[PDB]
Structure 1
Amino acid sequence: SHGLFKKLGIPGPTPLPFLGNILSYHKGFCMFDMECHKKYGKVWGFYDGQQPVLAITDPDMIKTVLVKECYSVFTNRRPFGPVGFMKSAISIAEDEEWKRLRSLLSPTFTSGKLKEMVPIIAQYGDVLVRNLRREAETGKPVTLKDVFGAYSMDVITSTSFGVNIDSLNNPNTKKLLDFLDPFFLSITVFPFLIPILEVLNICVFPREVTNFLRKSVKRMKESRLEDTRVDFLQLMIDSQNALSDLELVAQSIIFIFAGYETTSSVLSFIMYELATHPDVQQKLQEEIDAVLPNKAPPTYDTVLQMEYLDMVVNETLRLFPIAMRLERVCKKDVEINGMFIPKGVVVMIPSYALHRDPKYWTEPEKFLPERFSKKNKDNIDPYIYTPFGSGPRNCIGMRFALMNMKLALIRVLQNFSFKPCKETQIPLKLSLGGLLQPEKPVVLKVESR
């Protein structure tokens, strides 16, 4: 089993019995991945316990697996762990079930819908400003994640279900999904357990989170079913009259999670950058003022007008792609771009690493929004820079997240400035676990303008 990459003649760190190359995750697997890239070059193999994982870095090879051979050979992400009813969630579902869930849910994020979520969020901008304006008094540090997390929550519920639960006025989901903890280490390493827990009804999500979201999303549901907008919660009612009940809740939980957790983490990273780069912060405050004269209310079209904003957002995502790695399980023997990949292998694209490769980026540790200007934008390979994945299985929420973040940014910057305080971590360190987090909360002071 551990003979695979020696047999295919693919380079790699030497696996230990049982553990595989697991111990190398000790100092976080963005580092492991960087090390590997440097040490082995363009393609390598390692073992999550007994699982062979082939890393590929060739822009062409990546396009083939992400785009060309998706439907046929590379359709599914890793077999994750013990999901429960979340088996149905779109990001977890495989093969046919996924295709069906995809075109069922993909119309959720069209122009018209998006355009129709600009006024809905437009009330949450007004409550985010107000929250911060109150927090500008004390003049002490601040936790961006906490104030930003509640914004995300509010936007997600109100659009996807059209349910205002006014989170911004009420100070589960963060307790949802540990590497050091024997847990994922006993599964990421050891998968043979999984079918057991599926009978034990044990879940990667605590029973109490999903039970809440269960009866809660069952409640946002009831209200609709009698009283007489074509939205997310509405779209899934369409299919029920070939969708089902727990399949409806499943999609909801992923969406609530995605929209809450990622949106706020990214927004924290951007603010961190704008403080630690005030010139960039000013240039943006300028653009915002140029497009929106007089602290005016952002809009769908005025949002797309802002080039430098988009450049800022893109460059944060170069440094801090919250996914680390894209993955695709190889479901039949295959030969892509002159390389043989056997059925069963997990093909891995090390996004964080390629986003930092001395090859495609000069000065790759530095935050340089300009590397994204219309002048330079075309020298950038859509297959080295993939914060949203690519091909059919790419991020369905991309356009919502970008607009939502930007709406959060426009309004916040047309009202406030951001500066490091003494409880700001300069520079920033990543925590070692799964998705990209800062090892200490991002904390910054906030002047009124």
Structure 2
Amino acid sequence: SHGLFKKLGIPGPTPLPFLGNILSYHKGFCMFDMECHKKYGKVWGFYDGQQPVLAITDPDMIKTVLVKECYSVFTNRRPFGPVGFMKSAISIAEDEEWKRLRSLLSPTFTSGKLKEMVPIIAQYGDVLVRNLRREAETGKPVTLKDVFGAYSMDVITSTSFGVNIDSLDPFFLSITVFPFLIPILEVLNICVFPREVTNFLRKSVKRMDFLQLMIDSQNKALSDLELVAQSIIFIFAGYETTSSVLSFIMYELATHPDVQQKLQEEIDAVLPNKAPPTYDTVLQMEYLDMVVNETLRLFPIAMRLERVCKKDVEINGMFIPKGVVVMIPSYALHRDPKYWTEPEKFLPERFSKKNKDNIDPYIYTPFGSGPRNCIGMRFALMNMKLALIRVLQNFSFKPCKETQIPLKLSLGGLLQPEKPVVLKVESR
């Protein structure tokens, strides 16, 4: 099974028995793909244990997989287990089960449903400023992801269910070499999500908007244990992703103060006298969008986009056998000098309307693409921008003595910083 890429004439690192190429993950997914992208070029292959993974970097080939041949060949991602009842989660579901869930949950982030959330979100931002105004007086370093995650959790519980609360690898290493053990753990009720975290919610969702828009579309319809599984996906997505990217954004503004002031100038221009950010004023701030896009270029929290080839195909002149996991190294593409001038530098001017057109939307894919892209892309941009407006309207951010500069990425599994992002906060 380890000769599939030698057979197909596809270059790649030499795999070891059983382990495949997993030992190369010692520097993390990001550094591995960046090297592989430089070592072999447009297309290479490797083996996650016994699982062959093909990495494509051709924009036409990427557009073919994510968009053109999604409903037919590349519908589902890499299988993930043990999941239990979470198999019905939309990010985990497959084939016709996914198409039904994606349609049922797609009217949750329409342009109208998001506009109803701006008056609701506008509450915890003041809780966010007032929670940040107390550490301000304390005159000391601040952990951003804590006060951001506390804010982000307040938004996700209310935008989907409406609960108001003031919010104040070790084992997956064996999953990839033992994917045959995944069916074993599914019959033991073993779950990668600890069974006490889910049991805290296997009744809490029954113990309770997105929650409204599910039973209303239940009345070939929606179940109830699956309703809990979608809540878990949304609750995690709105918490961790929003807080993590906001931590990355405030770090870049602190280490690049000129961008922070020019951002504060536009915020006070569209919203004078510290005006409350509305839906229409958020989409007007283009420099805010440029700061958001550039930070997502340097830190695409997903790193990779993956699809399982479900039958033999010959896309863009290359045969791909059945079962191969097609992977797009998003972190590697976002830092390729063959597309980005001085790629390691934070430059929001890449996304100005003077330069936003020299950017392939199949190289810069922080939210994926095609029918399986990030379903909450428009909410996440809105939720973060409403948070950046209300915070930068009141505070400036400076690095501290303990601030990690340059920021070391987590050499581990998911895209996070090694040391938590701490900065000094000053009141305007």
Instruction: Give the distance between the partners of 2:229 and 2:100, measured in 1 at CA.
Output: 14
Which runs of structure 1 show a deviation greater than 4 angstroms over 4 or more consecutive aligned residues? none
Distance 1:271 1:213 in 2: 32
Q: Which runs of 5+ in 1 are unaligned?
A: 168-179, 221-230
CA shift for structure 1 position 181: 4.3
Distance 1:418 1:217 in 2: 38
Query: Within 5 A, what are the aligned runs for 1:381-400?
Result: 381-400=360-379
CA distance in 1, matches of 2:112, 2:45: 44
CA distance in 2, matches of 1:371, 1:112: 30
CA deviation map 1:355-387 (0-9, x unaligned): 000101000000000010000000000000000
The Cα offsets for residues 273-307 of structure 1, whole Å up to 9 and x where unpaired, read as 00001100000000000000111100100000100
Corresponding residue for residue 377 of structure 1: 356
Counterpart CA distance in 2 for 1:218 and 1:424 is: 43
The separation in 2 between residues aligned to 1:67 and 1:299, in whole angstroms, is 33
Alpha-carbon offset, residue 130 of structure 1: 0.3
Residues in 2 aligned to 1:406 and 1:343: alpha-carbon distance in whole angstroms: 42
Deviations 1:316-352 (A, max 9, x none): 0000000000000000000100000000000000000
1: CA distance, partners of 2:292 / 2:177: 35
Q: Deviations over 1:243-301 (max 9, x none)?
A: 11111000000000000000000000000000001100000000000000111100100
Indicate if the aligned counterparts of 2:127 and 2:166 stay in contact, CA closer than 8 A: no
Report SS of the residue matched to 2:44. strand
CA distances 1:58-111 after superposition (whole Å, capped 9, x unpaired): 000000000000000000000012111000000000000000000100000011
> Aligned-pair distance for 1:219?
1.2
The Cα shift of 1:15 comes to: 0.4
| Alpha-carbon displacement from aligned partner over 1:108-131 (angstroms, at most 9, x marks no partner) | 001111000000001111100000
Q: Matches of 2:302 and 2:290 in 1, distance apart?
A: 19
The yes-or-no answer on 1:194 pairing with 2:182 is yes
Q: For residues 178 and 357 of structure 2, what CA distance do their matches in structure 1 show?
A: 43
CA distance in 2, matches of 1:214, 1:149: 23
Which residues in structure 2 correspond to 1:45-444 (within 5 Å)? 45-167=45-167, 181-220=169-208, 231-241=209-219, 242-444=221-423
**Do the aligned partners of 2:2 and 2:15 also contact (CA within 8 Å) in 1?**
yes
Cα 1:308–1:181 change in 2 (3 A) is closer
Q: Which secondary structure state, in structure 1, belongs to the residue aligned with residue 90 of structure 2?
A: coil
Q: Distance in 2 between matches of 1:37 and 1:394?
A: 23
TM-score under structure 2 length normalisation: 0.99
Q: Distance in 2 between matches of 1:296 and 1:434?
A: 40
- Measured after TM superposition, the shift of residue 163 of structure 1 is 1.7
Displacement of 1:215 in angstroms is 1.7
**Corresponding residue SS for 1:137:** helix
**Identity between Structure 1 and Structure 2 (%):** 100
Query: For the residues of structure 2 that align with 1:371 and 1:298, how far apart are their CA atoms?
Result: 25
Contact 2:88 2:226 in 1 (8 A): yes
Contact 2:410 2:417 in 1 (8 A): yes
Note the C-alpha offset of 1:239. 2.9
TM-score by length of 1: 0.94
Which residue of 2 is the match for residue 11 of structure 1? Answer: 11
SS class of match (2:426): strand
Give the Cα–Cα distance (whole angstroms) in 1 for the partners of residues 160 and 88 of structure 2. 18
Name whichever of 107-116 and 156-165 sits farther off: 156-165
Deviations 1:11-50 (A, max 9, x none): 0000000000010001111000000000000000000000
Deviation of 1:189 (Å): 2.4
State the shift of 1:434 in Å: 2.5
| TM-superposed deviation, 1:164 | 1.3
- For the residue of structure 2 that corresponds to 1:445, the secondary structure is strand
Any idea what SS the aligned residue of 1:216 has? coil
Q: 1:182 deviation in Å?
A: 4.2
Offset from partner CA, 1:193-225 (integer Å, 9 cap, x none): 0000001111110111111122221111xxxxx
Q: Distance in 2 between matches of 1:385 and 1:368?
A: 15
Secondary structure of the residue aligned to 2:425 is strand
Secondary structure of 1:55 counterpart: strand
CA offset at residue 188 of structure 1? Answer: 2.0
CA distance in 2 between counterparts of 1:252 and 1:102 reads: 14
RMSD over equivalenced CA pairs, Å: 1.7
SS in 2 for 1:259: helix
Q: CA deviation at 1:147?
A: 0.5
Contact 2:169–2:413 (CA under 8 A) maintained in structure 1: no
Structure 2 Cα separation of the partners of residues 343 and 238 of structure 1: 39
2:53 alignment partner, SS class: strand
The separation in 1 between residues aligned to 2:224 and 2:26, in whole angstroms, is 41
